[PDB]
Amino acid sequence: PAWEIPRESIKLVKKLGAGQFGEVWMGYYNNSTKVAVKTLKPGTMSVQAFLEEANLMKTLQHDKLVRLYAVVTKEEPIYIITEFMAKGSLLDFLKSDEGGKVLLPKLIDFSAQIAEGMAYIERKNYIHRDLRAANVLVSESLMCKIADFGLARVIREGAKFPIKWTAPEAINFGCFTIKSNVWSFGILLYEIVTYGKIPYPGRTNADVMSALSQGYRMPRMENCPDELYDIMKMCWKEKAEERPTFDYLQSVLDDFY
Ligand SMILES: Nc1ncnc2c1ncn2[C@@H]1O[C@H](COP(=O)(O)OP(=O)(O)NP(=O)(O)O)[C@@H](O)[C@H]1O
Numbered sequence: 001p002a003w004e005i006p007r008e009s010i011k012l013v014k015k016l017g018a019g020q021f022g023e024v025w026m027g028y029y030n031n032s033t034k035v036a037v038k039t040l041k042p043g044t045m046s047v048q049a050f051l052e053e054a055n056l057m058k059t060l061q062h063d064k065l066v067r068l069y070a071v072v073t074k075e076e077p078i079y080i081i082t083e084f085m086a087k088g089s090l091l092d093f094l095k096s097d098e099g100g101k102v103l104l105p106k107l108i109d110f111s112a113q114i115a116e117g118m119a120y121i122e123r124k125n126y127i128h129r130d131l132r133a134a135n136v137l138v139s140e141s142l143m144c145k146i147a148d149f150g151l152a153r154v155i156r157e158g159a160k161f162p163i164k165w166t167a168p169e170a171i172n173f174g175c176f177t178i179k180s181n182v183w184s185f186g187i188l189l190y191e192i193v194t195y196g197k198i199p200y201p202g203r204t205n206a207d208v209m210s211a212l213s214q215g216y217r218m219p220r221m222e223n224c225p226d227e228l229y230d231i232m233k234m235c236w237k238e239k240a241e242e243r244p245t246f247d248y249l250q251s252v253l254d255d256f257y
Pocket residue numbers: 016017018019021024036066082083084085086088089092134135137147148150
């Protein structure tokens with residue numbers, strides 16, 4: 001398309017992450033613009049499967065969603081070039097010394113920002129399926145954007161749904177809808193309020209999907225206001241239909257203060 005750029009017009013500077021499917025690098029699109037470069041380790045994923053994430057992003061363009069800038073697909077090492085987010089994932093940020101110092105007001109902000117990005121995704125008739133703090137990125141101005149549309153569909157090779165973030169009807173019946181993303185959002189609120197703690201501490205994945213089939217919900221966590229817990233408990237309603245829309249969450253969270 002007009003998304004292709006020559007390999008020469010990007011310089012990779014610092015390595016950010018590893019993984020089985022390739023690497024992520026900080027870089028520059030012809031010197032001028034700071035970018036993130038996702039690298040495919042040839043042989044691992046299919047090239048078509050690796051680019052499905054990019055193909056998806058071509059359609060998904062909103063401020064609270066990491067934007068795609070371009071791709072390099074003509075030559076063996078395939079690149080996905082996206083907007084650089086200075087503070088990394090929300091998970092890592094929340095756990096850093098700096099993030100440990102961010103008070104509850106700005107946590108509700110982060111949370112409301114993601115609800116905004118998700119409200120676009122549901123308005124666009126899409127599902128994300130992989131919504132969690134590790135898949136949300138933070139800019140220098142402390143803006144949150146949704147990332148990682150590897151599992152996002154218009155309503156898989158590699159690819160593992162996040163069991164501990166996935167709605168019970170999605171696990172047990174394979175029923176992924178925007179309402180299952182609302183479930184995931186509730187867990188993402190848990191991650192925010194606890195500064196990046198793992199869901200269901202000390203519970204294996206199997207324990208969790210068994211516990212959920214018995215109506216387990218995480219009890220009110222320390223340093224979480226009734227009102228914020230009621231938002232979580234709203235996302236964790238058994239019947240998917242009875243869970244609120246993202247447009248509602250963005251409203252209720254935004255006026256939280
Ligand atoms: N746009 C970006 N700006 C800055 N850092 C990023 C960006 N995208 C990814 N990273 C970092 O690179 C790492 C991997 O990113 P991610 O998009 O999760 O790749 P992945 O292979 O899909 N998932 P994982 O294997 O769990 O890291 C994370 O630790 C992020 O901190």
